[PDB]
């Protein structure tokens, strides 16, 4: 599944309270930037 989010705000630490992270691989960003900075659009592709 895929969702694209525009014109919204997100409380990220509430979403990280629901999961435990084993490993993250990031290119050209960091999760700290996604915890602080703003951007034009957000796309999430999630599967099991």
């Amino acid at each position: 599944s895929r969702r694209v989010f525009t014109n919204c705000n997100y409380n990220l630490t509430k979403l990280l309270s629901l999961v435990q992270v084993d490993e993250f691989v990031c290119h050209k960003t960091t999760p700290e930037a996604l915890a602080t900075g703003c951007y034009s659009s957000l796309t999430v592709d999630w599967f099991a």
């Binding site: 990220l12 630490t13 990280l16 992270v21 993250f24 990031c26 960091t30 999760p31 700290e32």
Partner: protein, 49 residues
């Protein structure tokens, strides 16, 4: 710290570990070592948890 949460000590992580408990400094050379003291070594020494 257990191995199931060693990604919290990875660089760029947004977990509370880095921003409240241990913020590693990278201005000077470093090595972060995740090791396990086994039970037999733990009883051989006085190492407990």
């Amino acid at each position: 710290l257990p191995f199931s949460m060693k990604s919290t000590l990875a660089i760029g992580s947004a977990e509370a570990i880095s921003m409240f408990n241990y913020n590693q400094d990278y201005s000077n050379p470093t090595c972060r070592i995740h090791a396990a003291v086994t039970a037999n070594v733990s009883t051989a020494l006085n190492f407990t948890a």
